[PDB]
Amino acid sequence: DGRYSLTYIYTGLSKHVEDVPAFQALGSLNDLQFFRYNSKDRKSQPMGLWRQVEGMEDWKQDSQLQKAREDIFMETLKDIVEYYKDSTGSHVLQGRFGCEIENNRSSGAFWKYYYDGKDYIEFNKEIPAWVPFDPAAQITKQKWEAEPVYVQRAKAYLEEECPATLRKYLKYSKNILDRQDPPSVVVTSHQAPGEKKKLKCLAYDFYPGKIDVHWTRAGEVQEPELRGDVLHNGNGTYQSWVVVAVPPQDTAPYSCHVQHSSLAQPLVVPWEA
Numbered sequence: 001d002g003r004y005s006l007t008y009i010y011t012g013l014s015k016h017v018e019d020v021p022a023f024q025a026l027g028s029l030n031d032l033q034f035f036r037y038n039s040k041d042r043k044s045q046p047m048g049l050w051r052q053v054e055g056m057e058d059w060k061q062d063s064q065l066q067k068a069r070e071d072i073f074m075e076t077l078k079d080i081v082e083y084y085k086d087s088t089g090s091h092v093l094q095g096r097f098g099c100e101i102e103n104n105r106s107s108g109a110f111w112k113y114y115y116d117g118k119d120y121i122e123f124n125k126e127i128p129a130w131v132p133f134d135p136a137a138q139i140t141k142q143k144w145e146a147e148p149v150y151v152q153r154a155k156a157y158l159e160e161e162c163p164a165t166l167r168k169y170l171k172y173s174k175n176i177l178d179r180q181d182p183p184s185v186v187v188t189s190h191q192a193p194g195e196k197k198k199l200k201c202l203a204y205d206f207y208p209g210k211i212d213v214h215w216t217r218a219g220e221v222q223e224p225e226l227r228g229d230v231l232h233n234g235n236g237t238y239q240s241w242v243v244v245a246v247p248p249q250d251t252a253p254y255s256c257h258v259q260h261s262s263l264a265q266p267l268v269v270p271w272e273a
């Protein structure tokens with residue numbers, strides 16, 4: 001087994017402009033986002049390849065869960081703006097929490113909130129208690145610790161419940177996170193009216209994203225003019241290209257070389273003028 005992480009990020013706005021939900025929530029497994037929720041449609045929705053995964057989460061219910069998280073999230077934001085006597089301004093509260101395992105061994109945990117970009121409050125499951133970094137965080141901590149049970153629950157979420165969810169989610173996400181999809185390539189050349197000729201070598205439809213794409217000119221690894229790449233969450237595939245400029249009076253043979261963890265040995269693709 002290898003590394004796997006579960007992360008959730010909450011964003012709440014005290015005074016939201018039109019067409020922007022006051023509260024957004026999202027979740028990513030490793031390098032891919034699998035769900036999303038906002039205060040407009042108020043419905044948890046799977047994403048990417050998880051749109052086709054059946055029986056991993058009863059989203060209809062999770063929507064009710066989110067609606068609960070949301071009400072506590074904005075209230076917290078309400079109290080902060082309240083404290084600072086400035087409800088006329090536009091403020092923001094970001095929270096981040098999740099956990100990670102490695103070799104089926106819980107190896108991480110985090111739960112931190114940010115206010116207007118500054119560190120606000122974060123939980124330390126070792127004490128266990130919340131650490132306040134902002135004067136108003138002091139009240140929040142007070143409220144979130146009014147009963148001896150509260151900090152026991154939080155520790156319980158990071159050390160027991162969250163990793164439980166990661167493991168569950170992992171049983172249904174094998175055919176996704178563990179993929180090793182080989183990269184397909186296409187070497188194309190475009191000539192602009194005036195400049196030199198340019199050769200584009202694209203590597204598409206692959207996963208993981210760590211790839212090695214480069215050109216050569218008669219065996220000599222050439223320096224790229226343009227380099228780029230992207231992630232398409234819908235498919236859960238990466239794309240990575242490279243471009244080189246070729247002198248007007250050159251005949252030498254250009255070959256694109258692609259390396260990957262999915263490939264047994266590197267691929268080569270020459271450009272036939």
Ligand SMILES: *[C@@H]1O[C@H](CO)[C@@H](O[C@@H]2O[C@H](CO)[C@@H](O)[C@H](O)[C@H]2NC(C)=O)[C@H](O)[C@H]1NC(C)=O
Nearest residue numbers: 204205206230231232233234235236237238239
């Ligand atoms: C992942 O999504 C991308 C874009 O939605 C797919 O790539 C498109 O492929 C079509 C036909 O192959 C092209 O006409 C588009 O220009 C491509 N979009 C872009 C901007 O890359 C890709 O095929 C999807 N992955 C798979 C294998 O389904």
Ligand SMILES: *[C@@H]1O[C@H](CO)[C@@H](O)[C@H](O)[C@H]1NC(C)=O
Nearest residue numbers: 001101103104105106163167
């Ligand atoms: C770790 O994986 C094993 C199977 O390899 C599974 O039975 C177990 O529930 C997982 N976590 C543990 C040790 O509780």
